[PDB]
């Protein structure tokens, strides 16, 4: 349980993510995927980008992006009250695009690493341990409908 201090320092960074999240969502995805290249295996939209050049000019990436942070800043705004958006990202991450829980780990260590990078006077240690943690409360109550529905592993 995040206290409320907690979700002062991730919404406060966050608030700084909704400048550019078309930029923020390259960045990540890009890092994901240079990162932990089985991820980028998981999709068929993207898996003909080889290089970092090929995807930095994809729009289609880009606009995947957005969707990925749209959909996670809407979660943060939550403060742990989120059971309605996480069902059905569980459901579809679970079900159809086949996503084990440890990609989640890595994505979320890349949206770390980008905010470090683009916000650091609001990214200091404090705030980074509130997203850290931010981030493992999304990723455990994935896991837990992961579990319900036979997919945890
Ligand atoms: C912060 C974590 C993430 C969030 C908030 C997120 C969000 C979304 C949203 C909102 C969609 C479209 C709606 C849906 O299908 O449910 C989507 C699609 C999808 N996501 Fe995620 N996602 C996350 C992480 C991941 C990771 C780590 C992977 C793969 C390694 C992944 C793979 C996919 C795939 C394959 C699609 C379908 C893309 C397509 O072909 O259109 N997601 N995601």
Partial sequence: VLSEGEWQLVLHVWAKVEADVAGHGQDILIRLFKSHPETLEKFDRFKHLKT???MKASEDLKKHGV???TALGAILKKKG???AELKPLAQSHATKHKIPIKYLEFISEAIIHVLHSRHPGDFGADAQGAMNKA???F???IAAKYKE???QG
């Fill in 139 to 141: 990723r455990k109550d």
């Fill in 135 to 137: 981030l493992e409360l």
């Fill in 52 to 54: 970092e050049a090929e």
């Fill in 67 to 69: 969707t990925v942070l």
């Fill in 81 to 83: 009250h989120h059971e």
């Fill in 149 to 151: 529905l036979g997919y």
